[PDB]
Amino acid sequence: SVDDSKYQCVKLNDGHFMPVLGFGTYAPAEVPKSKALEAVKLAIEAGFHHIDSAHLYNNEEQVGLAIRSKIADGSVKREDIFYTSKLWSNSHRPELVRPALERSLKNLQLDYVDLYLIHFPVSVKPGEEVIPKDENGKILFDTVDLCATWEAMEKCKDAGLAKSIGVSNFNHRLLEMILNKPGLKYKPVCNQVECHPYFNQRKLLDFCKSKDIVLVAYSALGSHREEPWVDPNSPVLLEDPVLCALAKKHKRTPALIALRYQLQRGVVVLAKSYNEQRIRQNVQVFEFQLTSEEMKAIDGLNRNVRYLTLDIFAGPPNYPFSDEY
Numbered sequence: 415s416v417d418d419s420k421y422q423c424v425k426l427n428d429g430h431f432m433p434v435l436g437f438g439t440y441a442p443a444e445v446p447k448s449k450a451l452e453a454v455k456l457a458i459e460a461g462f463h464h465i466d467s468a469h470l471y472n473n474e475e476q477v478g479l480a481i482r483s484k485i486a487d488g489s490v491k492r493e494d495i496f497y498t499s500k501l502w503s504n505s506h507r508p509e510l511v512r513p514a515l516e517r518s519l520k521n522l523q524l525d526y527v528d529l530y531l532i533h534f535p536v537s538v539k540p541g542e543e544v545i546p547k548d549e550n551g552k553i554l555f556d557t558v559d560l561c562a563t564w565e566a567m568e569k570c571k572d573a574g575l576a577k578s579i580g581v582s583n584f585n586h587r588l589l590e591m592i593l594n595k596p597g598l599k600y601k602p603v604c605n606q607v608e609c610h611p612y613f614n615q616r617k618l619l620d621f622c623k624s625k626d627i628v629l630v631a632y633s634a635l636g637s638h639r640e641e642p643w644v645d646p647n648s649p650v651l652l653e654d655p656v657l658c659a660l661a662k663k664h665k666r667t668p669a670l671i672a673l674r675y676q677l678q679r680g681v682v683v684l685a686k687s688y689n690e691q692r693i694r695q696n697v698q699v700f701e702f703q704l705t706s707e708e709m710k711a712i713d714g715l716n717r718n719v720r721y722l723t724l725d726i727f728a729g730p731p732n733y734p735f736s737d738e739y
């Protein structure tokens with residue numbers, strides 16, 4: 415309202431600017447994928463300028479319609495929306511990268527994405543199934559050199575189909591593999607990974623900072639907690655007593671504390687909500703600040719709780735979460 419023409423962004427290592435608060439669009443299987451349309455419209459209306467999705471989420475038709483609808487009605491311009499998609503692991507083969515991006519863009523009915531990520535570093539066999547399995551129920555993994563996948567990502571950026579390219583769920587070793595690649599043209603702008611006060615990623619964050627790679631935090635509110643992907647006996651982040659005490663002190667909410675913690679440590683933070691009140695609330699992250707002693711307290715919550723292990727993909731050497739970081 416006073417001035418919605420400006421918003422907080424960070425400069426990426428390719429010269430583009432990423433808004434530091436992103437809207438998460440994934441919703442669990444029981445929610446119809448038609449509900450994404452209204453939520454993204456509300457997010458844009460509330461002041462979200464970064465919107466995160468993926469081929470895998472099966473929502474790109476709805477997400478794209480929401481964005482085009484808010485442009486067509488004058489609420490926002492394309493250049494003031496930062497839209498992220500992701501390449502699913504059935505399309506890591508380098509010949510399949512551009513086809514997967516074009517398919518996303520066709521669903522979205524947008525001419526480009528602002529950011530395209532390698533979704534998850536374990537490759538699976540190509541085909542229409544997102545999770546291909548053999549007669550024994552075993553996932554059919556694929557042997558793909560991610561360096562060759564990255565080259566294909568770079569060509570997407572050169573063709574203008576993605577303004578920026580980055581990675582997701584990469585560990586130290588995998589990031590170094592890309593950074594040391596022969597003939598590297600574009601460093602990844604970001605590594606999008608799980609990050610919240612119970613798994614604050616300080617080692618991986620500092621490695622990213624040392625390379626001017628932005629860490630983008632997912633499940634920053636403690637995740638969707640969807641079974642079987644998240645164990646229901648994992649601790650509920652937003653019931654943490656230090657977060658709740660800080661929220662009460664600031665007259666905010668635990669969610670807001672968790673989001674603000676990320677902003678102050680130089681992380682770009684995602685937040686999914688399909689609720690009008692919570693969508694609005696989340697944008698209050700820009701209205702208050704945490705002191706150094708509050709930030710120290712939150713750092714003290716770190717406790718090795720990874721909600722999303724994605725261990726259905728464990729086994730191959732690119733499985734990213736068996737290394738320390």
Ligand SMILES: NC(=O)c1ccc[n+]([C@@H]2O[C@H](COP(=O)([O-])OP(=O)(O)OC[C@H]3O[C@@H](n4cnc5c(N)ncnc54)[C@H](OP(=O)(O)O)[C@@H]3O)[C@@H](O)[C@H]2O)c1
Pocket residue numbers: 437438439440441466467533582583606607631632633634635636637638639652667669670684685686687688689692693695696722
């Ligand atoms: N790269 C990847 O592999 C990957 C993996 C996971 C996620 N992501 C991305 O990151 C996004 C966020 O992660 P997430 O989906 O795990 O969820 P998340 O943002 O951590 O949030 C989880 C929950 O918080 C609730 N919530 C939101 N605002 C709240 C508030 N102010 N107070 C209380 N509760 C609040 C939501 O419910 P309500 O909706 O009911 O408000 C939602 O169930 C995803 O949607 C996706 O875009 C990426």
Ligand SMILES: CC(=O)[C@H]1CC[C@H]2[C@@H]3CCC4=CC(=O)CC[C@]4(C)[C@H]3CC[C@]12C
Pocket residue numbers: 440443470471544545643722724
């Ligand atoms: C965003 C997220 O947490 C990811 C991690 C694992 C992903 C799921 C993995 C299994 C899967 C297979 C499908 O066929 C539909 C999408 C789903 C149900 C995925 C939805 C998005 C998930 C839940």
